Design a protein around this ligand. Structure first.
Ligand SMILES: *[C@@H]1O[C@H](CO)[C@@H](O[C@@H]2O[C@H](CO)[C@@H](O[C@@H]3O[C@H](CO)[C@@H](O[C@@H]4O[C@H](CO)[C@@H](O)[C@H](O)[C@H]4NC(C)=O)[C@H](O)[C@H]3NC(C)=O)[C@H](O)[C@H]2NC(C)=O)[C@H](O)[C@H]1NC(C)=O
Ligand SMILES: *[C@@H]1O[C@H](CO)[C@@H](O[C@@H]2O[C@H](CO)[C@@H](O[C@@H]3O[C@H](CO)[C@@H](O)[C@H](O)[C@H]3NC(C)=O)[C@H](O)[C@H]2NC(C)=O)[C@H](O)[C@H]1NC(C)=O
Ligand SMILES: *[C@@H]1O[C@H](CO)[C@@H](O[C@@H]2O[C@H](CO)[C@@H](O)[C@H](O)[C@H]2NC(C)=O)[C@H](O)[C@H]1NC(C)=O
Ligand SMILES: *[C@@H]1O[C@H](CO)[C@@H](O[C@@H]2O[C@H](CO)[C@@H](O)[C@H](O)[C@H]2NC(C)=O)[C@H](O)[C@H]1NC(C)=O
Ligand SMILES: *[C@@H]1O[C@H](CO)[C@@H](O[C@@H]2O[C@H](CO)[C@@H](O)[C@H](O)[C@H]2NC(C)=O)[C@H](O)[C@H]1NC(C)=O
Ligand SMILES: CC(=O)N[C@@H]1[C@@H](O)[C@H](O)[C@@H](CO)O[C@H]1O
Ligand SMILES: *[C@@H]1O[C@H](CO)[C@@H](O)[C@H](O)[C@H]1NC(C)=O
Ligand SMILES: [Ca+2]
Ligand SMILES: [Ca+2]
Lengths: 96, 948, 48, 48
């Protein structure tokens, strides 16, 4: 909650449209440190739902508790780690 | 306020000034004398309506007899060649060589053609061989395709033989039931390609007779999810296989049966009705339990209505379910014990239900069973039901072989508006002994030949008659095969709200303004019977801004071979025309120099109608090189003109002398007039002369005489006609062009009224302003309006700046009251072939509503008081004599601070008329009298269940 | 990154998918040194 | 029957009939892709 709050909400969008530019979207850089759009005519802004339709994120105590439990159960923790790697840099999320 | 008698003094003084200036400057009486002074360079010939229609009806009948012979020749060879086929299974060494379209090989060898450039074809073609189109979903090089691709190679010999007899022959296409279409001449195919020859309107109309389809949709709970949107897409693709001769309705059942739309019975399934069903079927939701007994009872009862118009042909029920455990034996036994209705069942989606009852309901009801597990199977499985419906047609044999002509549609290969003749091809292998009879119950394909609407337009010439007259042909459904108002654009539906595969089916009543008499004429024309009627009609102008009433004569006759009916609209003052009679050289030559661009100063800037004078001389649509290509041609080609028609060449050359005589003998005397900015004259021959060489450029008019709105407007009216300039900087027309006035000349040669040409001037608006005042008064407003409520002259500066604008957009309170007091009438129409900017939920086709205003009462004096609330406004209106102008006087808008919503006379993107209440009283129509269903020898022993 | 991948495999997340992705017929990154023309050489049957 | 919300695909680990529910429960017990079934169950009741 203290670290990864409200950061999974920036995906590669299209130029002046509300259409996601990826079939399997991933978050962009929250502050220019993570992943940036590479396609020529794509930009990413806020307003995205989330990686798993909003289920998996750290922007609430219930959401954070659920995703922490899921990561503890060895199932799908690398997905959350890679989404963190897309949102922020590579150095902080791997420690967590 | 001035008295009524005082206003008449104001109007009479200004009316005399306007008429005298228009009469003297244009030279109406001088050109009339010029036409009557010779009376020997030309002859007056009658325009017999009865002979003109019958001669043109025989030309169209003979033209369609050309194509019927080609279809019979093509169908005879295709059946004979295929009957002698051995079904080879290996194509390794005996490779099949053919030219596949849309290209930059197990047993296929490609062909590289030359592709010369040919006229009467908007692309490169090749007469050396025939091209083959194979849809993307269909793999070329399979056993089915290669066998179909080997015996069809003998069709090329007939393809070339057909063109040898008739060089003016368009595409000849063989649409195979395999999927590939082989057409001649070879031409490269036109994003991705979704063209399937088995879904084309001409293929579907020949694969089976009309139908009475009734779609049953399962909206029970079990279909929610993927299999619901699969059904919605499946139904939408199924509606694409219907035409205007087929009647359809959609119903849904979930423990209760009901219609998904507003129709409540079978409807004609045209473009408007199919849109309603498509929109309604996309709004369905899945909920409840399944009741097959209550669903089939609803479907069977709707096929026994007989209250309304139907097809009286194939009666089919298409059930869109997934699976079930109910067979409803009693319902089928009760309703169709004699099996008079087919039942086609579709199992849609990935499910684990029981398909047993679904399979049984098809075999026991002379139907077929289809499976649609995903989106990729929707397109192929929604067109295969025409194989079952074609069984009674193939067993009929020779009697079920007639050429059918489709509706007007845009060609896929970018050729324009065309129609196609259709003839099915049967599989007759072993028919000489009648032993197989198993796969011989399906058609091989459909043979088609295209006829362009330009070909039909050549058989109905219009240059021997006035611009207000025209031909038009009708179809038994009421649609127009030929009409001036038909355009090469798809007919739109509703307003396009976004975040040419349909035919251009335009009704006769929607082509022009409707009337009570027109409905009677249309009904008589549909069933087929000669007639003639003369009556008074109100006619819209070329620019959809004016309406004028004029006597018209309708003469219609039916075409013999086909079911079309041809009619000729011909007003009065046009039963006689001018046929030029001059063959001498020096008299003809001196008229040819008048056209020389150089003398555009002495003769005044000259335009030439881009008519088809001779074959080699091609039109250019600019009137700069075409004029140069004309005098050069007339000074280089011998007068014999072996291939060039002299009737048009004599008509235009005769008017060159007639028109220049007015310019030189009369217009040159008055070099400059204070109130005249330009002088013009337009003639039936097709030459327009503007004296101020300069003015020539300001001439924003069509060089073709027969498309000038002011020309036809001046022919109907028997006085001076004022045309308001277009608003919003539509070219230079505000102050550098002026108000256009026109007046048609009237000639009495031997007691026959003739209107060969029109004359007029362009009034200088600045000079007219000074005469009008003899200004910016805050007490009263003085404006002059024309027939149509367009502002032409005011005294408030800001009013004058917006010249040629509708008065309802600048003073809605006064204009609205005028319509109520019955001085301005109006009739509203619908323009189906219009394009508009899409709105919120490029440009897309849509329907627009047009309104036009015209004088209602014949009285010339109008006075009254306007009550806008908590105030009072008094006005007086007088109409000027021998013109279409009305002068009205009213006080300022600031005296009463009221401003209602502005009245709009412009192209409004509407969506009407409502189709929910047009099916209650549909227009009269006549369906085909041939039907092929319920044959005794039909097998119907195979469905999709036994094989599946 | 190799240690992280091995930790992922030890936890057993998609190790068979990684093995499939390490098969011989795989594209080579431009920064590697390889002869022109043979772009798809990296990856080996040793992955299984 | 509540796993028909996606409308773009068909789901294999559902609770449609008894054998399918039994297989889904066994798969969850094995622990493989149990979070996917949890996400489907959550989205079947209104999502996050
Ligand atoms: C017009 O009608 C005639 C018959 O009235 C029709 O000619 C018949 O065509 C069929 C093919 O559609 C031939 O069928 C033979 O028998 C089977 C049927 O497919 C084939 O054997 C295998 O069958 C499987 C499917 O069951 C298939 O997948 C496979 O490819 C087939 N071949 C193999 C395994 O090698 C035979 O190969 C096939 N051909 C033979 C035996 O030569 C009939 O034999 C044809 N009958 C006659 C009298 O010619 C003709 O196609 C119809 N015209 C058109 C345009 O369809
Ligand atoms: C379906 O494909 C078949 C295989 O290509 C075609 O059959 C071949 O047609 C050729 C053209 O006539 C034949 O060549 C000559 O045939 C005559 C007739 O008997 C004979 O003189 C010789 O057989 C031959 N002449 C030579 C080789 O100088 C082939 O014999 C014939 N059969 C093969 C190639 O196996 C069919 O024509 C084709 N169907 C259609 C409608 O085009
Ligand atoms: C039209 O169809 C109806 C049933 O759909 C037929 O039944 C009659 O309907 C009209 C009023 O709709 C009434 O005469 C009676 O209610 C019905 N029965 C009879 C015996 O008339 C009707 O016969 C059909 N034809 C007409 C002209 O209505
Ligand atoms: C279509 O065929 C009918 C006859 O089937 C033609 O009717 C002819 O009418 C003229 C009078 O106008 C008679 O002199 C002929 O004797 C009629 N024909 C026959 C065979 O009796 C009709 O003219 C044909 N349509 C056209 C446009 O010619
Ligand atoms: C076009 O002209 C006028 C439009 O203003 C309409 O015709 C009149 O309609 C009223 C409606 O009650 C009748 O009372 C008049 O008798 C009509 N005038 C006639 C018949 O001359 C109508 O919209 C159009 N007229 C048509 C279609 O005939
Ligand atoms: C009242 C009015 O119509 N004003 C028009 C405006 O609509 C148009 O955009 C402009 C273009 O020059 O000319 C002026
Ligand atoms: C085709 O039509 C023309 C006129 O349209 C006619 O003269 C001719 O006889 C018809 N048939 C052939 C084979 O040209
Ligand atoms: Ca059900
Ligand atoms: Ca796992």
């Amino acid at each position: 909650l203290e670290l990864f709050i409200g950061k999974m909400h920036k995906t590669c969008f299209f130029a002046d449209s509300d259409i996601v530019a990826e079939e399997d979207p991933a978050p962009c850089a929250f502050s220019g440190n993570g992943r940036q759009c590479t396609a020529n005519g794509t930009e990413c802004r806020s307003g995205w739902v989330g990686p798993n339709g909003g289920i998996t994120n750290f922007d609430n105590f219930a959401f954070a508790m659920l995703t922490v439990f899921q990561c503890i159960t060895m199932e799908g923790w690398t997905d959350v780690l890679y989404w963190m790697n897309d949102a922020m840099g590579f150095e902080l999320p791997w420690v967590y | 306020f001035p008295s009524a008698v005082t206003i008449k003094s104001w109007v009479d003084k200004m009316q005399e000034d306007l008429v005298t200036l228009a009469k003297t400057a244009s030279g109406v009486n001088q050109l009339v004398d010029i036409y009557e002074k010779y009376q020997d360079l030309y002859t007056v010939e009658p325009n017999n309506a009865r002979q003109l229609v019958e001669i043109a009806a025989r030309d169209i009948e003979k033209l369609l007899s050309n194509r019927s012979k080609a279809l019979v020749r093509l169908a005879l060879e295709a059946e004979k060649v295929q009957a002698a086929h051995q079904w080879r299974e290996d194509f390794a060494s005996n490779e099949v060589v053919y030219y596949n379209a849309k290209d930059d090989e197990p047993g296929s060898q490609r062909i590289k053609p030359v592709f010369i450039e040919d006229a009467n074809f908007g692309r490169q073609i090749s007469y050396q061989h025939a091209a083959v189109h194979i849809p993307t979903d269909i793999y070329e090089g399979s056993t089915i395709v290669l066998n179909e691709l080997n015996w069809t190679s003998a069709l090329d010999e007939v393809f070339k033989k057909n063109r040898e007899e008739d060089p003016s022959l368009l595409w000849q296409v063989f649409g195979s039931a395999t999927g590939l279409a082989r057409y001649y001449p070879a031409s490269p195919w036109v994003k991705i390609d979704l063209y399937d020859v088995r879904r084309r309107p001409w293929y579907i109309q020949g694969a089976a007779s009309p139908k009475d389809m009734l779609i049953l949709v399962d909206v029970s709970g079990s279909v929610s999810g993927l299999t619901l949107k699969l059904i919605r897409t499946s139904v939408s693709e199924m509606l694409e296989t219907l035409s205007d001769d087929d009647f359809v309705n959609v119903a849904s059942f979930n423990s209760n049966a009901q219609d998904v739309s507003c129709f409540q019975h079978l409807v004609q399934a045209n473009v408007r009705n199919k849109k309603v069903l498509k929109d309604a079927v996309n709004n369905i939701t899945a909920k409840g339990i399944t009741d097959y007994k209550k669903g089939f009872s609803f479907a069977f009862e709707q096929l026994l209505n007989y209250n309304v118009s139907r097809a009286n042909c194939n009666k089919i029920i298409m059930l869109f379910t997934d699976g079930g455990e109910e067979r409803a034996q009693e319902i089928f036994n009760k309703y169709n014990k004699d099996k008079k209705v087919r039942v086609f069942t579709f199992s849609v989606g990935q499910h684990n239900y029981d398909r047993g009852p679904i399979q049984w309901m098809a075999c026991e009801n002379k139907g077929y069973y289809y499976e649609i597990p995903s989106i990729g199977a929707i397109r192929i499985n929604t067109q295969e039901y025409l194989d079952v419906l074609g069984r009674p047609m193939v067993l009929a044999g020779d009697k079920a072989k007639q050429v059918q002509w489709t509706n007007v549609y845009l060609d896929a290969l970018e050729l324009g508006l065309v129609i196609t003749g259709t003839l099915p091809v049967f599989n007759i292998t072993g028919q000489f002994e009648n032993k197989t009879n198993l796969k011989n119950q399906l058609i091989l394909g459909v043979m088609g030949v295209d006829v362009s609407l330009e070909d039909i337009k050549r058989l109905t010439p219009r240059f021997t008659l006035c611009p207000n007259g025209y031909y038009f042909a009708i179809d038994p459904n009421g649609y127009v095969l030929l009409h001036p108002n038909l355009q090469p654009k798809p007919i739109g539906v509703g307003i396009p709200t976004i975040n040419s595969q349909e035919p251009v089916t335009l009704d006769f009543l929607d082509a022009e303004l409707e009337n009570d008499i027109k409905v009677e004429i249309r009904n008589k024309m549909i069933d087929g019977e000669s007639g003639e009627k003369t009556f008074r009609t109100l006619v819209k102008s070329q620019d959809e801004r004016y309406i004028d009433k004029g006597n018209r004569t309708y003469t219609w006759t039916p075409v013999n071979g086909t079911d079309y009916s041809l009619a000729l609209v011909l007003p009065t003052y046009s039963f006689y025309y001018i046929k030029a009679k001059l063959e001498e050289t020096i008299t003809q030559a001196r008229y040819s120099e008048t056209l020389k661009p150089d003398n555009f100063e002495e003769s005044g800037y000259t335009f030439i109608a881009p008519r088809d004078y001779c074959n080699d001389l091609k039109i250019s649509d600019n009137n700069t090189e075409f004029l140069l290509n004309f005098n050069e041609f007339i000074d280089r080609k011998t007068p014999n003109n072996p291939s060039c028609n002299a009737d048009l060449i004599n008509r235009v050359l005769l008017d060159a002398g007639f028109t220049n005589e007015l310019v030189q003998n009369y217009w040159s005397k008055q070099k400059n007039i204070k109130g005249v900015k330009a002088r013009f004259v337009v003639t039936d021959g097709g030459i327009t002369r503007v004296y101020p060489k300069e003015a020539g450029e300001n001439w924003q008019e069509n060089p073709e005489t027969y498309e000038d709105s002011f020309y036809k407007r001046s022919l109907d009216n028997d006085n001076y006609v004022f045309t308001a300039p277009y608003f919003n900087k539509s070219g230079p027309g505000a102050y550098e062009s002026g108000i256009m006035v026109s007046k048609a000349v009237e000639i009495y040669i031997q007691g026959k009224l003739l209107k060969p040409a029109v004359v007029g001037i362009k009034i200088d608006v600045n000079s007219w302003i000074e005469n009008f005042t003899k200004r910016n008064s805050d007490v009263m407003d003085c404006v002059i309006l024309d027939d149509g409520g367009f502002l032409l002259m005011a005294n408030h500066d800001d009013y004058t700046n917006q010249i040629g604008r509708f008065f309802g957009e600048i003073d809605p309170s006064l204009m609205r009251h005028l319509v109520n007091i019955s001085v301005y009438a109006f009739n509203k129409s619908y323009d189906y072939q219009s394009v508009c900017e899409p709105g919120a939920a490029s440009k897309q086709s849509c329907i627009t509503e047009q309104t036009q205003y015209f004088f209602d009462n014949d009285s010339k004096s109008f006075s009254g008081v306007l009550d806008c609330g908590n105030c009072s406004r008094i006005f007086h209106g007088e109409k000027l004599m021998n013109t279409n102008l009305i002068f009205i006087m009213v006080e300022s808008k600031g005296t009463c601070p009221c401003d209602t919503r502005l009245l709009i006379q412009a192209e409004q993107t509407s969506d009407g008329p409502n189709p929910c209440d047009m099916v209650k009283q549909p227009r009269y129509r006549k369906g085909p009298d041939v039907c092929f269903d319920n044959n005794v020898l039909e097998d119907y022993t195979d469905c999709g269940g036994v094989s599946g | 990154q190799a240690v992280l991948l091995l930790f992922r495999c030890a936890t057993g997340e998609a190790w068979q998918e990684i093995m499939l992705a390490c098969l011989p017929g795989k594209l080579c990154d431009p920064e590697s040194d390889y002869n022109p023309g043979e772009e798809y050489t990296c990856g080996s049957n040793f992955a299984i | 029957g509540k796993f028909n919300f996606d409308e773009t695909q068909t789901k294999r680990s559902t609770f449609d009939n008894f054998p399918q529910a039994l297989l889904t429960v066994f798969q969850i017990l094995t622990g493989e892709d149990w979070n996917a079934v949890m996400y489907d169950g959550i989205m079947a009741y209104g999502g996050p």
